[PDB]
Nucleic acid binder design. Structure first.
Ligand SMILES: [Zn+2]
Lengths: 99, 1362, 68, 260, 67
RNA sequence: UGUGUGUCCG
């Protein structure tokens, strides 16, 4: 019964060794994942505030805009609409402001 | 014979460009047109033979070559033209004067008698009534001039015919004045000694044509001078004379009724105003209308100055005074007025300023603006005015546009959520809108005060389409008998070849909508949508957009645009889609009077997050059209496109207008420098331009109104106030609610409300200016209790009268298709009813109507235009001359019996009559009882039945089968159908109008009347939703005589010419009336004896008629009693017992309606003397499933199924009855629509068809001021004697009776406190619950209608279910 | 004696088998943290892209508007 | 013999259990460090909510701005170059700033296009609007004189001269608005225009204890047909409130006054 | 004595191994709890950033064909 | 020879 006991103990210790090795590999990959996850957090935190202030400044600056109408808006819109469907130049003669 | 029919009333702008040609043919000189091309062009074939005319040469033999403009001489002609000369017309209009006066007196008597029969009359009557009326009528200032001008109008109207060769002239010599008429041209020869002079010695009329030395040597030893004009000026002068006569007569008559104080201004001040305006015009030419135009704002300011006058009520008058002073200063510096003339010319506005009248009189005077004429228009000046404001560069603020777009989207979403249940399933990445997600999940909607920081979140919302493009239920909008523009190829073919100087290479086929509609092979709604989607309106041949000067106004000129036919169809489809789709989210509220609103409801509405005071201000909506740019309106247009399935439909105008060449389509002057070589690319000058960036008046009005409402909503959101807006005509009124605490008295409340309104106006001005549209703070006024809007003007809740605007428009002649007498009399009756709707007097309007009725009858009998000269309608139709008695008798029997009577006294109480036949019978009986000829009732009402058809019975459910009560509509419908038979290659109309259409219509109407008992209103209601109704609504499009006598398709069918048939039918109709004793039978006369009950008379009269339709089946739901004959009044004293309720009410008692008078006065302007001047307190079935965006056909099918199911409840054949009516409408099946059909549960269907379905709104025919001081109790009736009593009409009758009884007595003099309306026991019955039973089925094949035009609804379930 | 020894050995074998099955269950359940680790890298890359695109948008704003 | 092998196997198993327990201890330390490093990432919710809000707002605003303008937005350099020659505004819209365009307008050096000048002036002229001065009219001397003339009946009377002197004194004292307001209030309350003028000359503080102006006339011809009854010899110490409206002076030492 | 010592050693080994099963199971449960806790918030963050990037990219794409 | 001289959206 000594040989079978020795074989069983060897198999058990081999299984425990395999479990220890896979646990160590899991620890290593978990550490790598932690490092990768914590690598860019500072950059994200710093960049969020920059985007916040840039967006706030743009929204504030939008309120001080003055626009003047032009004489070639409807023609350009019509040309774009005609090109977007059966795309071709509108039939001649040319429109009011073709530029 | 002829294809011409000149108009009887002014309907065109006054343009005198062509007269420059006429003076060139006679050798004179004139400068009307600003186009030099007319100075050296080729004269037409006519107006060139004038040099061969001996009469014209004799006329122009002792006059200078120089002429004068006609706009400087119109007041002179008006003042110095009376009828004393020789006129070619044989029967002069002055001869048959006395008879007319006689008739008028008779009418007055009748009305009094009628009132005395009702129980209203008056108190302390005067014996001198008829003499006063006689003196007022005979002593009028504008009497003989009216007859003379009508003679002149008859002459010039007859002369305008004979378009062929060898034309003739007419000559009139009236003492000082000489008139020569020739084919739409008039020459006036006048003395020189009666023209105002300059400081240089020349008339003011020659200032701008001649130099000082040229005119003096031109006149030399001459005393008479000649002016040349068209035939429109004569019609205008005739209209002015008629209006002045009517105004003076009404003002004079109104003094007799109320000697102390009357609501009409006067008959002495108005004459002074007329003279002052005439002098101002004669001095200043056509430029005096700039001063005449200030009559209305000055009247408004003077009305506004009749209140507490805290601070701001004097600003508007000051601004108007400054403006009129500046205008008078600017237009008189060049002219060399004498100091006397300079002092005299200001009398008009000096009298206007210093007026002292009550607000009612000023409101009445507000309506005499157009009593001086209309200006002379020029194409050049109008084009220059339009060019400005349409090419200027604007500056916009993007943030305001963003906020407006967000408010637009928010309003649409709120409207969708309010109905339809819940939100519209917002797609597209909901996490982009934090704040709205909670509301969407909880299925709620933000109230309002918290919508200020999540406004931007409405930009990101996306959803499927919410509205349908198959919701057109009226095809008649596509054929309306109008005129359109021509193709770009033949754009210059609408001008005269002689004036142009060349023959255009290309010609058009037709220019009218109905003619082009029938020749379009591929017409369909889907085809129009595809045409719009492919941007087919940008094709080179679809860019014309002509202009047209508008009708009578007081401006330098306003224009409207005309588009080619397919673009016109696109515009009409867009307008219909916007009307039935959007624009219900932006409604017009109205009824914003604070003083006439419930205090609790007003306080509840005024809450945003306690007495409530509201103010208001009004802004003008006129120039918004030209101030719209694509940069501002693009997002709204894109959102409108997205709300439907369309792609490029709603921006048709902004894409093609800038590519068009703009000009005015005037016949006699083309654009400057137009030659054959530069025809494809013409130059732009004084009357043309290329780049148009703004909008056009009328087009896309609904979208612009929606944008304005969105702006107002944004302003309301910005400042924490409550705003209510209304839009009508060319203006919008905005009222602001302020809400105040309790202990704040009532003195500073008005000032605080005015301050709030002023700050709201400032904010709105800032917003609109940031949007590119500029308001005028000078023209914007703020008040606290005065609101004028459309047809309603209120002063602190008190309604002001305005009845002259309708009463002064009465005239013997009007356009009624071939000068039909029935049409003219109906128009006069409608005008009388509308006029008596306002004000409080009664007699003047009825006297005017009675005066004009006999005049129209005589003038049509003797001087009809459809026959040859010297023709007498009343001679051959009878064989004996038409006596006064025959006309008087034939003007008394009502029209429902076929008797040419439209002035029913019952209309003085309520607008809508329950039963025309019963009321007519009662009126005829009363009239015959008044005179001593009571033994004519049976022969008058017996008559003979006509040969009608079930179609006519369905069309008129409450009429009689007599030939004299029929209109001309059937004749025109038959003509149009006959024309369609040999024409209309539309390829989709032909499917609808197949060979067996009439057979199907007759069978459907016969089946609908085969129930037991027979009901007419139900059949008429059902018949309108069948394809027969669609065919009938397509058929009736003819509107005028000109299109009847001049159309190409109508008159190319050969057969009998239309004129002969019209003459035959006119002769037959004239024979039908005025004859008597020839169209009667003794069979019904003996059967209607010893009845003495108007309800029974009406019932047997209805049953005897339609006998060939109703074999022996009973008729129900058609007879109602006359409310005058159903109640009696007692006018109880303050302390007494009613004899009827006490002496004759012992066994069971008598039901009655009680009327009592309140004591609180609230407000009164200017005093509490009159009841009309004061106001008081006191206000006057669910389905299982619901479809999403249902089509028109689905809605019609659902309604028809509901009606059929509800009417037939005692039967068990609904499944077999509704089946044949749904095969031609929808693709669904029976027992599936019934799920959508609401489970109707009512009783006694006649009551639901009488008031619940509301065929008419009933309303009232009196002012609403007196209805707030009376309390009416109707619960005293007990068991309500269900019944034949209409409660709304009972309330209206009581209120109107009380108003009429006390209208000339002061409040303290009234000695009556309460009134009892006791009902008789003869005309009131019991109606039991009855139902219709059908013993057959329609058994007709209606499955052939497989066209998508307006009939079939393939795939109804497209938008989903609720 | 020997029976107790083999019983203890069998019990040890059973508990070692239970240890192996528990360890393999844990290893099976551990292959899910990559679902909760790739979002961090995705957010980093998307924030870099957002910074770039916002800088581009600001540059366009300066180029377009006249400004001062 | 087997006892030693059994003991050795037991010792080896115990040792292996020892380092596998150590490995599990290290593994749970690694896990604890895992949530320790994962904890400070959950705090970004407050930052990212505001970031999303402001980003969405800016996206909506500038998306609408670019959608309204077409494909010819005419960048600023193009507009500046296009203004130099043929100074009409360029085709297609353009963008400015309030301060920049205001400074450009206020400096007459660079020849700003005219139409832009009127457009900006019209846009900016409406920013100075409050609840006050909204519909307030501008009244000058001539306008008030014409307004007062329009109410007085007749012509050439002494009331015309009273109106003239009142207008002159009000223009000198810069109190025309008070005079006009008092006139309108008195006329509206019921008094006649002559009574209104009387209360004007009696109530305004500036019109208290003032010497009436003296004008010079050559002869009796300057006297109108409606002023002969009012001519009176001058009493000493004239008073404006007493009824003095004007003083007629002649070259030959003659003075006359008028009394209502 | 040897058999009793072997029995004691086996019992101690069994106690240690079952204890470390308990510890491993507790660690597994704690890891699952930490995982489920950190799923919804970070995922929401990721989709929000993705949507913002997409809309900004679309805006800039519309802007490029203008200069 | 003067194509119906003209007379739209609501
Ligand atoms: Zn009674």
């Amino acid at each position: 019964h000594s040989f079978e006991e020795v074989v069983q103990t060897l198999a058990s210790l081999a299984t425990v060794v395999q479990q220890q090795t896979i646990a160590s590999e899991s620890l290593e990959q978990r550490i790598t994942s932690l490092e990768n996850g914590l690598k860019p957090v500072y950059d994200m935190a710093k960049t969020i505030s920059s985007l916040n202030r840039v967006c706030a400044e743009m929204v504030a600056k939008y309120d001080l805009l003055v626009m003047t109408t032009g004489r070639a808006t409807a023609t350009a819109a019509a040309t774009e609409a005609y090109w977007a469907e059966h795309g071709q130049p509108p039939p001649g003669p040319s429109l009011y402001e073709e530029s | 014979q002829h294809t011409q029919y000149p108009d009887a009333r002014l309907s065109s702008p006054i343009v005198l460009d062509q007269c420059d040609l006429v003076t060139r043919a006679c050798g004179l000189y004139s400068s009307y047109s600003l186009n030099p091309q007319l100075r050296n062009c080729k004269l037409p074939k006519h107006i060139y033979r004038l040099k061969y005319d001996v009469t014209v040469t004799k006329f122009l033999s002792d006059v200078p070559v120089a002429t004068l403009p006609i706009d400087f001489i119109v007041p002179i002609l008006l003042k110095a033209l009376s009828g004393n000369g020789f006129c070619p017309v044989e029967p002069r209009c002055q001869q048959f004067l006395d008879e007319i006066i006689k008739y008028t007196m008779q009418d007055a008597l009748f009305l009094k008698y009628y009132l005395k029969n009702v129980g209203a009359q008056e108190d302390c009557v005067d014996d001198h009534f008829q003499e006063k009326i006689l003196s007022s009528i005979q002593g009028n200032e504008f009497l003989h001039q009216m007859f003379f001008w009508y003679d002149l109008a008859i002459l010039t109207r007859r002369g305008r015919l004979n378009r062929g060769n060898s034309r003739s002239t007419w000559f009139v010599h009236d003492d000082l004045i000489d008139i020569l008429g020739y084919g739409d041209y008039v020459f006036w020869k006048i003395p020189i000694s009666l023209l105002p002079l300059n400081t240089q010695g020349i008339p003011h009329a020659a200032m701008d044509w001649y130099q000082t030395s040229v005119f003096k040597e031109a006149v030399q030893g001459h005393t008479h001078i000649v002016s040349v004009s068209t035939a429109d000026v004569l019609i205008m002068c005739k209209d002015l004379i008629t209006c002045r006569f009517n105004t003076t007569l009404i003002s004079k008559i109104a003094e007799v009724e109320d000697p102390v104080c009357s609501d009409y201004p006067n008959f002495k001040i108005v004459s002074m105003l007329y003279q002052s305006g005439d002098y101002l015009l004669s001095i200043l030419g056509s430029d005096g209308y700039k001063i005449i135009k200030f009559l209305e704002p000055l009247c408004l300011a003077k009305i506004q100055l009749c209140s507490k006058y805290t601070e701001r009520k004097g600003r508007f008058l000051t601004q108007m005074h400054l403006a009129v002073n500046h205008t008078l200063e600017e237009i008189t510096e060049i002219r060399a007025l004498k100091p006397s003339q300079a002092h005299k010319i200001r009398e008009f506005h000096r009298t206007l300023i210093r007026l002292e009248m009550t607000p009612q009189q000023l409101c009445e005077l507000f309506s005499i603006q157009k009593h001086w004429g209309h200006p002379v228009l020029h194409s050049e000046t109008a084009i220059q005015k339009v060019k400005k404001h349409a090419t200027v560069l604007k500056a916009l603020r993007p943030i305001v546009i963003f906020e407006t777009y967000c408010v637009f989207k928010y309003s649409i979403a709120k409207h969708y959520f309010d109905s339809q249940g819940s939100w519209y399933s917002v797609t597209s990445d909901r996490n982009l809108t934090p704040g709205l997600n909670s509301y969407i999940k909880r299925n709620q909607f933000p109230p309002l005060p918290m919508i200020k920081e999540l406004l931007w979140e409405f930009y990101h919302l996306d959803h499927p389409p919410l509205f349908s493009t198959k919701i057109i239920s009226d095809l008649s909008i596509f054929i309306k008998d109008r005129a359109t523009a021509v193709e770009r190829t033949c754009w210059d073919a609408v001008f005269e070849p002689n004036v142009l100087g060349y023959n255009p290479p290309h010609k058009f086929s037709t220019k009218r909508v109905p003619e082009q509609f029938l020749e379009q092979e591929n017409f369909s709604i889907e085809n129009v949508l595809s045409y719009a989607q492919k941007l087919e309106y940008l094709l080179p041949q679809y860019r014309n957009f002509s202009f047209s000067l508008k009708e009578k106004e007081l401006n330098v000129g306003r224009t409207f645009g005309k588009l080619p036919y397919p673009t016109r169809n696109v515009q009409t489809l867009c307008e219909a889609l916007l009307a039935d789709g959007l624009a219900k989210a932006f409604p017009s509220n109205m009824m914003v009077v604070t003083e006439r609103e419930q205090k609790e409801s007003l306080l509840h509405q005024a809450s945003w997050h306690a007495t409530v005071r509201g103010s208001s201000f009004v802004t003008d909506l006129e120039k918004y059209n030209l101030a719209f740019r694509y940069e501002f309106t693009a997002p709204f247009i894109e959102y409108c496109n997205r709300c439907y399935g369309v792609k490029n439909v709603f921006n048709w105008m902004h894409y093609t207008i800038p590519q068009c060449y703009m000009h005015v389509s005037d016949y006699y002057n083309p654009p400057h420098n137009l030659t054959l070589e530069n025809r494809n690319n013409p130059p732009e000058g004084p009357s043309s331009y290329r780049g148009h960036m703004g909008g056009i008046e009328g087009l896309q009005q609904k979208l612009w109104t929606s944008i304005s409402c969105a702006q107002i909503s944004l302003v309301e959101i910005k400042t924490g106030f409550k705003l209510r807006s209304a839009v009508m005509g060319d203006n919008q009124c905005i009222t602001v609610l302020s809400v105040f605490p309790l202990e704040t008295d009532a003195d500073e409340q008005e000032q605080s409300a005015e301050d709030n309104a002023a700050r709201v106006a400032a904010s709105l001005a800032k917003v609109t200016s940031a949007c590119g549209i500029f308001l005028k703070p000078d023209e914007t006024f703020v008040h606290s209790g005065f609101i004028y809007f459309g047809k309603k003007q209120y002063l602190n809740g008190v309604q002001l009268p305005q009845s002259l605007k309708t009463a002064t428009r009465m005239a013997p002649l009007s356009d009624a298709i071939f000068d039909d007498l029935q049409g003219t009399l109906a128009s006069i009756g409608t005008a009388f009813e509308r006029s008596i709707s306002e004000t409080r007097h009664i007699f003047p309007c009825r006297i005017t109507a009675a005066f004009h009725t006999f005049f129209s009858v005589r003038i049509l009998q003797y001087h009809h235009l459809g026959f040859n000269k010297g023709f007498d309608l009343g001679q051959l139709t009878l064989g004996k001359p038409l006596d006064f008695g025959t006309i008087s008798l034939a003007l008394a029997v009502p029209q429902v019996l076929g008797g040419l009577s439209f002035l029913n006294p019952e209309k003085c109480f309520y607008r809508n009559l329950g039963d025309p036949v019963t009321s007519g019978l009662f009126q005829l009986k009363t009239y015959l009882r008044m005179i001593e000829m009571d033994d004519l009732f049976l022969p008058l009402i017996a008559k003979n039945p006509g040969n009608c058809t079930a179609i006519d019975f369905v069309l008129n459910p409450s009429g009689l089968n007599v030939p004299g009560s029929q209109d001309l509509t059937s004749f025109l419908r038959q003509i149009v159908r006959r024309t369609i038979t040999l024409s209309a290659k539309n390829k989709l109309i032909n499917t609808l109008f197949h060979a067996s259409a009439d057979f199907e219509d007759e069978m459907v109407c016969k089946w609908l009347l085969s129930s037991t008992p027979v009901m007419s209103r139900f059949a008429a209601d059902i018949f309108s939703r069948t394809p027969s109704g669609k065919r009938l609504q397509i058929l009736g499009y003819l509107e005028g005589t000109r299109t009847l006598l001049a159309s190409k398709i109508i008159n190319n069918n050969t057969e009998t010419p239309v004129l002969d048939r019209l003459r035959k039918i006119t002769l037959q109709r004239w024979s039908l009336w005025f004859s008597y004793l020839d169209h009667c039978d003794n069979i019904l006369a003996e059967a209607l004896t010893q009845i003495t009950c108007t309800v029974d008379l009406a019932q047997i009269l209805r049953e005897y008629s339609w006998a060939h339709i109703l074999e022996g089946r009973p008729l129900i739901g058609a007879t109602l009693p006359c409310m005058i004959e159903q109640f009696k009044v007692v006018w109880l004293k303050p302390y007494e017992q009613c004899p009827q309720c006490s002496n004759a009410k012992q066994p069971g008692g008598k039901p009655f309606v009680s009327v009592a008078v309140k004591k609180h006065i609230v407000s009164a302007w200017p005093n509490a003397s009159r009841i009309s001047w004061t106001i008081g307190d006191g206000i006057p079935g669910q389905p299982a499933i619901k479809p999403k965006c249902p089509s028109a056909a689905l809605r019609e099918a659902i309604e028809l199924a509901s009606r059929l199911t509800w009417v037939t409840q005692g039967s068990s054949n609904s499944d077999l009855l509704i089946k044949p009516f749904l095969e031609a409408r929808v693709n669904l099946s029976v027992q599936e629509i019934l799920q959508m059909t609401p489970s109707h549960y009512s009783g006694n269907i006649v009551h639901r068809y009488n008031d619940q379905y509301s065929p008419h709104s009933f309303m009232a025919n009196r002012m609403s001021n007196s209805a707030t001081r009376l309390i009416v109790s109707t619960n005293t009736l007990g068991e309500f004697s269900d019944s034949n009593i209409i409660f709304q009409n009972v309330i209206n009758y009581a209120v109107a009776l009380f108003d009429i009884k006390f209208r000339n007595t002061e409040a303290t003099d009234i000695q009556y406190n309460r009134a009892h309306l006791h009902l008789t026991k003869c005309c009131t019955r019991e109606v039991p619950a009855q139902y219709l039973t059908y013993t057959s089925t329609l058994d007709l094949d209606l499955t052939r209608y497989r066209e998508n035009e307006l009939i079939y609804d393939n795939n109804p379930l497209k938008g989903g279910l609720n | 004696s020997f029976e107790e020894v083999v019983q203890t050995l069998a019990s040890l074998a059973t508990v070692v088998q239970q240890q192996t099955i528990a360890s393999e269950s844990l290893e099976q359940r551990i292959t899910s943290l990559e679902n909760g680790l790739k979002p961090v890298y995705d957010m980093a890359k998307t924030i870099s892209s957002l910074n770039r695109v916002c800088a581009e948008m600001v540059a366009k704003y300066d180029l377009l508007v006249m400004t001062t | 013999h087997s006892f030693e092998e059994v003991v050795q196997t037991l010792a080896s198993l115990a040792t292996v259990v020892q380092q596998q327990t150590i490995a599990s201890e290290s593994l749970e330390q690694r896990i604890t460090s895992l949530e320790n490093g994962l904890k400070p990432v959950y705090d970004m919710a407050k930052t990212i909510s505001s970031l999303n809000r402001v980003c969405a707002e800016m996206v909506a605003k500038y998306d609408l701005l670019v959608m309204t303008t077409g494909r010819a937005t005419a960048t600023a350099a193009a507009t500046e170059a296009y203004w130099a020659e043929h100074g009409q505004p360029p085709p297609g819209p353009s963008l400015y700033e309030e301060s920049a365009i205001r400074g450009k307008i206020e400096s007459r050096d660079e020849t700003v296009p005219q139409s832009v000048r009127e457009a900006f002036n019209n846009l900016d002229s409406t920013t100075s609007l409050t609840e006050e001065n909204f519909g307030k009219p501008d009244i000058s001397a001539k306008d008030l004189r014409n307004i007062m003339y329009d109410h007085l009946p007749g012509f050439g009377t002494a009331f015309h001269q009273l109106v003239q002197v009142i207008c002159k004194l009000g223009k000198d004292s810069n109190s025309l608005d008070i005079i006009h307001a008092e006139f309108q209030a008195s006329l509206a309350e019921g008094d006649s225009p002559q009574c209104a003028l009387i209360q004007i000359t009696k109530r305004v503080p500036i019109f208290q204890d003032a010497a009436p102006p003296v004008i010079h006339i050559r002869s009796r011809g300057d006297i109108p047909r409606a002023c002969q009854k009012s001519l009176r010899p001058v009493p000493p110490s004239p008073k404006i409130d007493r009824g003095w409206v004007c003083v007629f002076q002649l070259q030959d030492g003659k003075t006359l006054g008028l009394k209502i």
